[PDB]
Structure formats: C-alpha cells, structure tokens
Design a protein around this ligand. Structure first.
Ligand SMILES: Nc1nc2c(c(=O)[nH]1)[n+](Cc1ccc(F)c(F)c1)cn2[C@@H]1O[C@H](COP(=O)(O)O)[C@@H](O)[C@H]1O
Ligand SMILES: [Mg+2]
Length: 281
C-alpha cells in the first residue's frame, strides 16, 4: 500500500501492475536503485502563477550573450526544423537526419559567438528557471541515500548544471548526460564535448554496481526510451508528467507510462515512492 499514489494528480491505467513494480523496487531497496530523469518540464516546472516557465533552450535563446543576428538565425532554424519534428506523418527515421542537422547547425552557430564559460552562470542567474516543488526533498534524499541520478537533456549541460548549482542542490550523486560546451584554455567556446545528444538518442548509451532497478521520470512520449542502453534492467517504473494538451494526450500517456502525473508541479509522488522504497531494505 502506497499512500502517495492516491494524490489527485495520479493516473494509472494498471494500478495492480504498478503495485507489483513498486513492490519489486521495494525489495531491491536503495542498493539496486538508480533514477533516470529528463530535465526540462520534468525536474523543472511547466508553469508558475499562470505563467509558462522557460526551457533550458529558452534560457539560452533569450539571453544577453546571444546577439540579435545569432538569435535570428536560431529562430529561422526553429521555424524550419520544428515543423519536421512534430510532423504527424513522418516516422522517427524520417525525422532523424533533420534533427541531427538542426542540432549540428545550432551548435555550430553557438561556436561562432564569443561565448565564455563564466557567462553561463550569469545567464542562469538572470533567468526565470524554476524547479518543481519538493526538489529539496528529491535531491537531498537521493544524495543522502547514495542513489545515482542521471539527468538527460539534449540541450546545453552547462545550463542545467548552473540551474541545479544555483538552487544549492548539485550533490555529487547527480550526473548530467547532455551536450557540454568545450572551452579552450582562454575560456572561449570552441565546440561541444562528447557525442552529440539530440532528441532521438537521449538515452543511457550516451553515458554501475548492480543498479538493476530504475525509476524513469519524463514529460514526453520520447522520454520513455531514456533507460534504453542500461544493461540487465530487472525492474523499471516509468512516471510521466502530463503538463499540456491534457485531453488530447491523456489516453496516450496513460497507455505508455506506468504512472501519469497530470498538471502536477510537484515531486510529491516521486518523493513518496522514493521514501517507500528506501525505507524497506
Ligand atoms: N525552444 C527551442 N527548443 C529547441 C531548440 C531551439 O532552438 N529552441 N532546439 C534546437 C537547438 C539544439 C541545440 C542547441 F544547442 C540549441 F541552442 C538549439 C531544439 N529544441 C527542442 O529540444 C527538444 C529535445 O530536447 P529535450 O529532450 O532535452 O527537451 C526538442 O523537442 C526540440 O523542440
Ligand atoms: Mg522534458
């Protein structure tokens, strides 16, 4: 019996199956647990006080480090490629090369600007970034219980890192899997480290001591693949935030996610399950 799953925001297509998965995670305990979470609109809020909260892309796109001309080119890239991303009549494989182009073109553009490492903190300090209510309990509980948290984003990892750092919850159990800026010795942006992470490879292959049990947190249908690449996953619980277009997407989300949290700007349910799992061996 999990009290937290009775919150008004909770939707479960198969509650009996959910209680089976939760009971399996309970028996594994913290020793076998890892959390794999998207960032934008999952750990960060969708809206606050009737106003939409920015994505990590918005924080960069509206920032003062980006010039007028560069912002115009980034906008033209979006008007070109975003309709491809959301085209209902194309398969993933018919969107994949264009998303790779979109990301490569945007990164190449950022590298033509004179971005310096210290400017990222300034961009975040002035932004309206907000984490979901209960983030202190979420990050603090994972850290004190030695639970690895992998945060996935196809955006800029330095931006995510500075948001969490400035909220005083960047504990060493946090591992951000994203596109990190590559700075030269002078501190100027010259490229991006590692392999490109775009919207279709935001999964664990971009990244363990018996971490067979997974809690997955996301807000998009694409986020369901984030744990793909984790070897020997014995149990997985997928929790999805349904923030927008609720009537159109509710049945889809309930079919795909084990637990759906509808218009819930808190981590209350995730924190309750975490406490339930960790407290029972
Ligand atoms: N607002 C905004 N959104 C973008 C942009 C953008 O320019 N502006 N771009 C292009 C871009 C790529 C790399 C950059 F460094 C950059 F500055 C711009 C991608 N997206 C979104 O990224 C989500 C997947 O990533 P996530 O899984 O992490 O949410 C997808 O739904 C995309 O619509
Ligand atoms: Mg997201």
């Amino acid at each position: 019996e999990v009290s937290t799953l009775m919150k008004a925001t909770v939707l479960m297509r198969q509650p009996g199956r959910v209680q089976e998965i939760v009971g399996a995670l309970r028996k594994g305990g913290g020793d076998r647990l890892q959390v794999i979470s998207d960032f934008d609109m999952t750990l960060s809020r969708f809206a606050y006080n009737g106003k939409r909260c920015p994505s990590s892309y918005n924080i960069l796109d509206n920032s003062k480090i980006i010039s007028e001309e560069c912002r115009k080119e980034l906008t033209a890239l979006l008007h070109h490629y975003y309709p491809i991303e959301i085209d209902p009549h194309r398969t993933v494989k018919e969107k994949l090369p264009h998303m790779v182009e979109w990301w490569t073109k945007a990164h190449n553009l950022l590298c033509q600007q004179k971005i310096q490492k210290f400017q990222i903190a300034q961009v975040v300090r002035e932004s309206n970034a907000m984490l979901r209510e209960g983030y202190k309990t979420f990050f603090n509980t994972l850290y004190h219980n030695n639970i690895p948290l992998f945060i996935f984003s196809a955006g800029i990892g330095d931006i995510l890192e500075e948001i969490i750092r400035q909220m005083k919850v960047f504990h060493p159990n946090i591992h951000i899997v994203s596109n990190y800026m590559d700075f030269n010795e002078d501190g100027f942006l010259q490229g991006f480290k590692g392999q490109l992470i775009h919207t279709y490879n935001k999964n664990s292959s971009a990244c363990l001591e018996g971490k067979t049990n997974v809690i997955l947190l996301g807000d998009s249908i694409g986020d369901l693949t984030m744990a793909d690449g984790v070897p020997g996953v014995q149990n997985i619980l997928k929790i999805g935030f349904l923030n927008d277009k609720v009537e159109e997407r509710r049945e889809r989300y309930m079919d795909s996610y084990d637990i759906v949290l509808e218009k819930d700007e808190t981590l209350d349910v995730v924190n309750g399950l975490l406490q339930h799992i960790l407290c029972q061996g």
